[PDB]
Amino acid sequence: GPMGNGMNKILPGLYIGNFKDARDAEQLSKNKVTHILSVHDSARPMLEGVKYLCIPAADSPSQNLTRHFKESIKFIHECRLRGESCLVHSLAGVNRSVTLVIAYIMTVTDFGWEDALHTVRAGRSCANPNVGFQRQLQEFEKHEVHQYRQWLKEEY
């Protein structure tokens, strides 16, 4: 459905869900989620036992997510390197969150954004970034992802 069927594993230690999934203490416990990247209009820390990164971002044609790629990648990567699990969520788990996870996959693989979206959709079939975020991902692929891969190499 258009908001998924519950949070979905994308890669080990990396989940995508909707806003309800992100407050589902039982879902979070079952999946050992200790980090939440919340990217939606009213993102703010809510639950105990969870490290948050909150990015108030709209689903609107002018919303810039590229400038949040680096902090999002750092947050997800340091969680995963410690053997912990991160949930990236938005309102629907379709668009804003998927865009950040695509950027992460592009940086820890040699994938362009389309192969990264294929990877996301294998775990969460409803994943579908809008055209504005697709354009940002295409520009990231063309001009910046190679530098992000090198930064990840030097940092970790």
Residue numbers in the entry: -1 to 154
Task: Show the paper's wording.
DUSP22 is a small phosphatase containing 184 residues, and the sequence contains a catalytic domain as well as an N-terminal myristoylation site. This enzyme is broadly expressed in different tissues and plays important roles in the regulation of signaling pathways, such as inactivating the T cell receptor (TCR) signaling pathway, activating the JNK signaling pathway, and regulating the phosphorylation of focal adhesion kinase (FAK). The phosphatase domain of DUSP22 consists of five twisted β-sheets and six α-helices, and the structural scaffold is similar to that of DUSP3 (VHR), while DUSP22 does not contain an N-terminal α-helix surrounded by the N-loop. In this region, the catalytic activity is facilitated by C88 in the P-loop and D57 in the D-loop, and the hydrogen bonding network is formed by D57 in the D-loop, S93 in the P-loop, and N128 in the N-loop.
The S93 mutants were combined with a second mutation, C88S, to produce proteins for growing better crystals, which improved the resolution (<1.6 Å) and helped to determine the structures. In contrast, the N93 in the crystal structure of C88S/S93N had a different effect and formed the hydrogen bonding with the side chain of D57 and the backbone amide of N128. The side chain of N128 also interacted with the side chain of D57. The DPN–triloop interaction formed but was not precise. This DPN–triloop interaction lacked a hydrogen bond between the side chains of N93 and N128, and the positions of D57 and N128 were shifted due to a spatial barrier from N93. The decrease in catalytic efficiency in S93N was associated with this conformational change. This result indicated that the formation of the DPN–triloop interaction through S93 induced precise spatial localization to stabilize active site structure and maintain phosphatase activity. Even though S93N interacts with N128 and D57 in the crystal structure, the positions of D57 and N128 are different from those in the WT, and the N-loop and the D-loop are shifted. In the S93N mutant, N93 is a barrier that blocks D57 close to the substrate and decreases kcat.
